[PDB]
């Protein structure tokens, strides 16, 4: 009994989310070491001064949803992995949203967005695990509401972490929420 409004991983790299600023920050990446390609939005501008990198979903039609659940899956590399140059590395990133009746398209104004939470990993990925291709996937969920406008955006702010965002699943929940088969 979940109704899914957005599912990044299911979309196979095709959603073309907005990134700000032009060039520097979040980047759509692919990994093809498994049977099927994996997509993600990654950023890893550690050792590069202050970072303020934004990734914005497309507009999401709310429909009947009043309270949404936002499920994220992501990796974070240990700041000890990088030369002495966390004096220039963080292990969190920030989740934001904004409601609006109309889609503003390519006009992204971060001042319209409210922070939902700081997102922190239960497990950081250390270099030996990274080099062995055993990354530590984290799952975090947050809920937002009550929603009142025709739609909304989510956005992700990186402040200088080494993070890969592999899944963004937004749903609302009806009674009898279970699986089967």
């Amino acid at each position: 009994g979940e109704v899914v409004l957005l599912d990044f991983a299911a979309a196979g790299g095709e959603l073309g989310w907005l990134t700000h600023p032009y060039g520097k920050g979040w980047d759509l990446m692919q990994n093809i070491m498994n049977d099927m390609p994996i997509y993600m939005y990654s950023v890893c501008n550690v050792m590069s001064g202050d970072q303020d990198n934004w990734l914005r979903t497309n507009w999401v039609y709310r429909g009947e949803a009043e309270r949404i659940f936002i499920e994220l899956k992501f990796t974070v590399r240990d700041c000890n992995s990088f030369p002495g140059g966390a004096s220039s590395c963080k292990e969190t990133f920030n989740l934001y949203y904004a409601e609006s009746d109309l889609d503003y398209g390519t006009n992204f104004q971060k001042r319209l967005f409210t922070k939902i939470d700081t997102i922190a990993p239960d497990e950081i990925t250390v270099s030996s695990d990274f080099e062995a291709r055993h990354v530590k996937l984290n799952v975090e969920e947050r809920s937002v509401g009550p929603l009142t406008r025709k739609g909304f955006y989510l956005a992700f702010q990186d402040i200088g972490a080494c993070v890969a965002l592999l899944s963004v699943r937004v749903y609302y929940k009806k009674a009898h929420h279970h699986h089967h088969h």
């Binding site: 759509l28 990446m29 692919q30 990994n31 993600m40 890893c44 990796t75 992995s81 080494c162 890969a164």
Partner: peptide, 14 residues
């Protein structure tokens, strides 16, 4: 530089 995820490369649908 460093990558966030092993064996990842920039991707854009064509």
């Amino acid at each position: 530089x460093w990558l966030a995820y092993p064996d990842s490369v920039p991707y854009r649908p064509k």
